[PDB]
Design a protein around this ligand. Sequence first.
Ligand SMILES: Nc1ccc(O[C@H]2O[C@H](CO)[C@H](O)[C@H](O)[C@H]2O)cc1
Ligand SMILES: Nc1ccc(O[C@H]2O[C@H](CO)[C@H](O)[C@H](O)[C@H]2O)cc1
Ligand SMILES: Nc1ccc(O[C@H]2O[C@H](CO)[C@H](O)[C@H](O)[C@H]2O)cc1
Ligand SMILES: Nc1ccc(O[C@H]2O[C@H](CO)[C@H](O)[C@H](O)[C@H]2O)cc1
Ligand SMILES: Nc1ccc(O[C@H]2O[C@H](CO)[C@H](O)[C@H](O)[C@H]2O)cc1
Lengths: 103, 103, 103, 103, 103
Amino acid sequence: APQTITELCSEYRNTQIYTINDKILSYTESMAGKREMVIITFKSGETFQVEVPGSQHIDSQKKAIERMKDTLRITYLTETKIDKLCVWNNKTPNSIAAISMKN
Amino acid sequence: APQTITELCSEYRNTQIYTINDKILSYTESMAGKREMVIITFKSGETFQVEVPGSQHIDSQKKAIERMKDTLRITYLTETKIDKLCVWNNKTPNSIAAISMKN
Amino acid sequence: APQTITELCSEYRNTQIYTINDKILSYTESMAGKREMVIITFKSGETFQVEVPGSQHIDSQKKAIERMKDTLRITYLTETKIDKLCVWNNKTPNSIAAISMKN
Amino acid sequence: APQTITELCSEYRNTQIYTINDKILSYTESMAGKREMVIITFKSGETFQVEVPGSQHIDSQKKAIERMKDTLRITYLTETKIDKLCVWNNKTPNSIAAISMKN
Amino acid sequence: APQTITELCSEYRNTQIYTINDKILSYTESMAGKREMVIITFKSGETFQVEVPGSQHIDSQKKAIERMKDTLRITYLTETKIDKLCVWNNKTPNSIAAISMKN
Ligand SMILES: Nc1ccc(O[C@H]2O[C@H](CO)[C@H](O)[C@H](O)[C@H]2O)cc1
Ligand SMILES: Nc1ccc(O[C@H]2O[C@H](CO)[C@H](O)[C@H](O)[C@H]2O)cc1
Ligand SMILES: Nc1ccc(O[C@H]2O[C@H](CO)[C@H](O)[C@H](O)[C@H]2O)cc1
Ligand SMILES: Nc1ccc(O[C@H]2O[C@H](CO)[C@H](O)[C@H](O)[C@H]2O)cc1
Ligand SMILES: Nc1ccc(O[C@H]2O[C@H](CO)[C@H](O)[C@H](O)[C@H]2O)cc1
């Protein structure tokens, strides 16, 4: 299995690593129909989303998707610094695939 | 996908943005039958609810409804400031569709 | 939909409001068969429970019962002050229907 | 229903109350097959477990088992003082049936 | 049932104990398809993973795998020191079977 987020990210096309090194500036969560998602922004001006579960997600990703949103909420509330985000760049906002945090 | 809560809110009928910019004043949670819900209030005098799951909700919203309630509880307990709320105004109290929080 | 704990409590047959205005003194949790419940007490001596799921409960209450127990634990662990509790008074300990907290 | 952990514990066979009055010394969690459990210890030299789910458990206990493990973890991480433990003494280490915390 | 992580670790093949006595240096979480996992690192330079659920896991481990990931996130966020890890050494990075922490 991959040993670092970069290793993991390099396994998928249409992805790139954003080296955030910062806490989340804003957290947005929606339970509106067809828009059950989370959006986060940073002081850098970058915006990212955890996508609404859909056709392109495999079954195994369902729990992971819910975990990622849990992670973003607690990271926001605790002001925990995010190191890097591996994101798909074929979506707007860019779509979160993986996250890493360094202490 | 929407980039902000304002963009997200604009996609729906009967919704509107309430700029809160304040922490929750009161949190109420009910496990009484047909009233399995959460009610939040602000010192401005505005009251909002996360609705009891009903037939208007689609399947993808079920986990989202539970998430929103989780978020309100931790937001209240931590005295975290809420920036905006996108709410359905055809319900009383106004029904929460989405929330945004900024540091 | 109800806008306060008193309003939802008043919808009921055999309930009453308890003004607590205090943090929880003790928290008890059981995973023993047929006694899967939570019991909390206050310095006043008053004792309450979140009942074991049973035939008197409608299906939509199942998830809410688990949420209420989650709330009581984090409320206890954070020493958060409870405002009021709506309880069904035909059970001992008095059975929690709803909880409210303000700060 | 029972008013206290001691009253609840007495409703069962092969159980007894351990007065701990102390925070958890160590926490051990396993996801190894057939050993999916939690083990805790105290400065007193006592060791306890939340058993691996099995035939001895009834359906209503499944979520309760998961809840107890959640409680032990958060109790350990917050250095929360445990009052009493109701344990089954026909298992080694003794098996947790209920827990109480007082502040 | 085993009384310590050492006793537990010894019941499986291809495992070994890693004495850590340190907080997690980095935490990585992925929701990418086929890579739904968590990777943790320590200042020692060691790297461990919670494997993607697969054919090597039995039913009972599914909830345990998700719990382990929950434990790693909260342990990382709280800078809690990890005492030891029981890992399967037939995977790269070494795969977490159990974890222990002492206060
Ligand atoms: N095998 C494979 C092929 C495509 C792929 O990406 C697609 O799915 C992702 C969600 O899983 C993102 O939505 C991304 O934007 C989509 O383009 C991921 C894996
Ligand atoms: N397609 C579609 C489906 C539902 C809908 O709104 C209804 O459901 C909302 C929750 O989903 C709110 O309860 C709102 O008050 C209702 O009016 C609008 C459009
Ligand atoms: N119409 C109606 C519905 C429920 C009701 O309360 C019953 O259910 C409660 C939990 O839902 C408590 O268990 C209470 O002790 C029971 O008496 C009373 C009237
Ligand atoms: N009806 C009933 C049946 C068994 C019982 O105890 C058994 O199950 C417990 C788990 O629930 C503990 O594992 C205990 O060690 C076992 O002896 C209690 C009540
Ligand atoms: N009975 C039995 C047989 C094999 C076994 O190990 C395999 O599964 C583990 C997770 O369950 C790890 O993935 C390990 O690396 C695999 O080798 C565990 C138990």
